[PDB]
Symmetry: D2
Subunit: 116 residues, 4 copies
Amino acid sequence: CPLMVKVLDAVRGSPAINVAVHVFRKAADDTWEPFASGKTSESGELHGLTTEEEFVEGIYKVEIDTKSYWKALGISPFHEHAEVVFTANDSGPRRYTIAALLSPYSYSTTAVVTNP
Amino acid sequence: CPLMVKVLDAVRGSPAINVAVHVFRKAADDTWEPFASGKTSESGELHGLTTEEEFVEGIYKVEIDTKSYWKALGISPFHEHAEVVFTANDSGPRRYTIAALLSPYSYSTTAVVTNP
Amino acid sequence: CPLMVKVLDAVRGSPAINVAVHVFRKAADDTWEPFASGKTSESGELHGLTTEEEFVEGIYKVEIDTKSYWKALGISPFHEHAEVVFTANDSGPRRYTIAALLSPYSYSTTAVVTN
Amino acid sequence: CPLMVKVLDAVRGSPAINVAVHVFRKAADDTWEPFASGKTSESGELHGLTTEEEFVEGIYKVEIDTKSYWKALGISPFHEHAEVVFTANDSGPRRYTIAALLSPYSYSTTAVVTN
Ligand SMILES: *CCC(=O)Nc1ccc(/C=C/c2cc(C)c(O)c(C)c2)cc1
Ligand SMILES: *CCC(=O)Nc1ccc(/C=C/c2cc(C)c(O)c(C)c2)cc1
């Protein structure tokens, strides 16, 4: 609910399924602490990463494992991953959708931020 | 259901609401016949354009009225519209999502095609 | 060179070479009249489409033949073409670059308008 | 010029000027070591980051300071930065252009790798 990730494949015209996603949160000492992880579903979506209680203010990194996705499909892509880094919840709780559209040598990403 | 259009705003980080969309289908005489139209909802989505019976094989044009969207928000954009032209249903019925991500001087578009 | 077109390939990480591009100007009767055309170069670019004298204010359409490009690479694409339709306005910078980044089921386009 | 970075602005239709870019190379201990940096030019480009001799195979990260760019324009952005992380491979073409197209809540990036 408060953080969702959607991944699409621009080659196939389909959801990007079984894409690994790791989320980190910047700690007080400036290191990236593991926060949540999961894999996209057959709809290219990953829900259930966190709760509104746990998803406090901070700087978050959403790392989408695009290389493995191309690798597990047998293809050699350019990027290691796609990383999305942003401050969240700093004016109170919001809901965030992080969307990515993937090609072997390119990607686009956007955020949809809503106030419930 | 068989044709859906989703429009996002890359400036606001939000759905693009109240965006006019016109769909045309190429006729036998090579003119563009009006096929369906509507406006995106508060979720940036437009459903209910057509039915699987009416959505036959053909070449379709999805014209997204991006200029008015920037104009109705009081902004002067580059493009007149974003047009998406594609052959549909030529190997049998499919479901099509046409997605667009808008900026004042740029847009991206993708398709998600699924076989029910 | 008031109008340039740049086409890139997101699958191969390269310029999109030998892509047909047609430019049209909207006529008084609302039909699209051919204006200029060419094929992208080895660097994915098409220069020399028009001159300052001919490129007056108006609505233009740049049609990029993406379907033929993908088919020549043996890849099944979604779109018939990519269309970029815009107004040229003299109350803006003078040089327009229309850039497109192509994938089989997606494209991105931007304008770089400079003085 | 084996590595070039190009940054474009999707709101204004222009090069993204005076954007800070930092390049890092992944070290043996898995930390990111500074490699090269600069600010984009009036044409949105940053050349002269490295030489052929120094740009060996490896994993590189190009960090584009998008947040400062938007803030200088008085626009509230979403991302802290844009990150492009990739492997340089000698069994590929020799010149890498990393391009980024920026909006306040979105960015696109591509690689153009040529000989
Ligand atoms: C409305 C559908 C939904 O519930 N969630 C959802 C739909 C679509 C997206 C993102 C689509 C998209 C399209 C394009 C062209 C680009 O470039 C990007 C990055 C994302 C997200 C969420
Ligand atoms: C032709 C020499 C050169 O490298 N010039 C150059 C022009 C443009 C780019 C990238 C453009 C671009 C366009 C779009 C629509 C997207 O999404 C991206 C990421 C980049 C590179 C180089």
